[PDB]
């Protein structure tokens, strides 16, 4: 891409400086990203008819439309034509948070269970949300990954240990911290032994609920970046189990690139099939 926004620009290369290009060998055609969030604007122009409703566990209806913005934004980072990682992925909105972003643990669990029960082909869930400890929530996410669907999970935004947050602390999940375009850990991002890797989450431009656009920061913006490359990886290999996908995200990641990691493993999202440091050692 000749004029790529920074986050896409970053994940296709090993080192700074940025080159204003997002290169891709895949687009996640044939895979489906389940976005567990405030819903998603199916009619947004970034999706070109590739987003549909799943279910709405806040209002108990069939229309998972977004009235907050956040879930449209993360869905745009996964599969938006201009500002997305996997530009022909399928998006399925699963609405578990209200217009104000508030949700119950029961409703979020219902969305996780729904994804486990309804995923058909190559699939990946994205949970750009977090809060206090919850073994019941942890247990539902642990169960959906056991059924064969990889869950990307935001680390949290409190400059704290991600091990005290659910669902972030679930080991079998892929817990994602946030970075800026200078390769620093975003100053808000959670950290520690529960975080598997970093991805662009500071100042990310993506779709908004109103059909236009917005640029916001959070581990919620970081997470869909890696869900997006999960879909790239899944098109390349449809039969990747959660374990194999987690491994492939780990071994393809750029190493020792991030500053102020605070005891986090120093791995940065990399979207192409190269291993170690290869393309630029």
Helix extents (H) in the chain: 6-11, 70-79, 105-118, 135-146, 219-236, 242-252
Question: Measured between alpha carbons, how far is residue 42 from residues 19, 26, 207, 227 in Å?
Answer: 32, 23, 11, 18
**How far apart (Å, rounded) are the C-alpha atoms in residues 242 and 247?**
8
Which of 2/117 has CB closer to Ca ion? 2
Of 30 and 118, which has the nearer Cβ to Ca ion? 118
Q: Label residue 280 exposed, middle or buried (CB < 10 Å: 0-12, 13-18, 19+).
A: exposed
- 37 is annotated as an active-site residue: yes
Place of tokens 């869909």: 224
Alpha-carbon span 46 to 43, nearest angstrom: 9
Interacting residues toward Ca ion by CB under 5 A = 9, 12-13, 19, 21, 56, 59, 61, 63, 171, 196
In the complex, minimum distance from the CB of residue 145 to Ca ion, in angstroms, rounded to a whole number:
10
Catalytic residue among 51, 123, 166, 220: 220
Catalytic residue (choose from 27, 44, 70, 128): 70
Clarify whether 220 is annotated catalytic: yes
Measured from the CB atom, is 46 or 56 closer to Ca ion?
Answer: 56
Active-site residue, 113 included: no
The single residue of 27, 37, 66, 161 carrying the catalytic annotation is 37
171 in a labelled binding site: yes
Binding residues for Ca(2+): 9, 12-13, 19, 21, 56, 61, 63, 171, 173, 196
Binding residues: 9, 12-13, 19, 21, 56, 61, 63, 171, 173, 196
Catalytic residues: 37, 70, 220
């Amino acid at each position: 891409q000749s004029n790529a926004i920074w986050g896409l620009d970053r994940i296709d290369q090993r080192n700074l400086p940025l080159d204003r290009n997002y290169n891709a060998n895949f687009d996640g055609f044939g895979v489906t990203a389940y976005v567990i969030d405030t819903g998603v604007n199916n009619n947004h122009e970034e999706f070109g008819g590739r987003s549909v409703s799943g279910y709405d566990f806040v209002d108990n209806d069939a229309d998972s439309s977004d009235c907050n913005g956040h879930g449209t934004h993360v869905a745009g980072t996964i599969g938006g034509s201009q500002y997305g990682v996997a530009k022909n992925v399928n998006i399925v909105g699963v609405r578990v948070l209200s217009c104000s972003g508030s949700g119950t643990t029961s409703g979020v669990i219902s969305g996780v269970d729904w994804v486990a029960q309804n995923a058909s082909g190559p699939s990946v869930a994205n949970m750009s949300l977090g809060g206090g400890q919850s073994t019941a929530l942890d247990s539902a996410v642990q169960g959906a990954i056991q059924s064969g669907v990889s869950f990307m999970l935001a680390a949290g935004n409190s400059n704290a240990d991600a091990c005290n947050t659910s669902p972030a602390r679930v080991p079998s999940g892929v817990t994602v911290g946030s970075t800026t375009s200078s390769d620093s850990r975003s100053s808000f991002s959670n950290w520690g032994s529960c975080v598997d890797l970093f991805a662009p989450g500071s100042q990310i431009k993506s779709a908004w609920y109103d059909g236009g656009y917005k640029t916001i920061s959070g581990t919620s913006m970081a997470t869909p970046h890696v869900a997006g490359v999960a879909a790239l990886y899944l098109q390349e290999n449809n039969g990747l189990t959660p374990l194999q996908l987690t491994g492939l995200l780990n071994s393809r990641a750029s190493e020792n690139k991030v500053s102020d990691t605070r005891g986090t493993t120093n791995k940065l999202l990399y979207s192409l099939a190269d291993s170690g440091c290869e393309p630029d050692c």
